[PDB]
Ligand SMILES: [Mg+2]
């Protein structure tokens with residue numbers, strides 16, 4: 092698989108700042124990495140993940156063969172690290188910096204494992220058909236809503252927000268909300284790639300999901316010249332449709348073995 096073909100686009104929208112981060116790399120001969128991090132309350136947490144997620148994963152690869160298990164551990168460990176980092180910095184705003192994290196690992200060119208927390212997304216496009224790889228952690232979900240309430244948190248409105256502050260129920264960072272139920276533990280999904288059909292991994296932040304459903308994303312991937320043109324087209328449509336938030340898309344082409 093060729094990382095030269097990865098397409099990526101990130102538009103600030105109408106925000107003062109762009110707090111979306113994204114990355115990809117080949118960790119080892121057998122493992123490729125792809126990630127988006129949608130930061131809020133300052134980029135600190137999103138930046139921390141961007142900077143360190145690869146090390147956390149690579150330190151785990153030889154210890155843990157189950158990649159769902161590995162990503163779960165990595166997420167929790169990096170969250171531990173950011174919490175210490177935050178509590179130690181002079182900048183007291185880090186205490187309320189946090190981020191989604193959507194991380195994909197592809198092993199041996201066929202085994203795709205995705206972990207995320209928050210409302211950024213991964214989908215797989217194959218034959219122009221989307222398959223969802225993540226489910227958004229929002230207060231709308233009964234199970235999430237119940238943990239928040241059982242942990243002592245609440246949900247307010249003006250649209251649902253954890254303790255009147257956070258539009259999602261899991262994240263990396265958000266130190267003050269951790270005991271109120273906003274956990275760093277990801278949900279995970281594992282699939283095998285198709286041997287004959289090409290497929291595309293697409294990572295997006297909620298700026299994009301607000302306005303472009305995942306079928307429409309597969310159409311762009313299916314119709315646009317290269318992944319790069321597709322990534323730009325997806326983000327630009329989101330903005331055209333009325334999105335004002337940071338909008339980020341990563342399009343990864345997988346060849347069929
Ligand atoms: Mg990197």
Ligand SMILES: [Mg+2]
Nearest residue numbers: 110129130131
């Ligand atoms: Mg953000």
Ligand SMILES: [Mg+2]
Nearest residue numbers: 129297298336
């Ligand atoms: Mg966002």
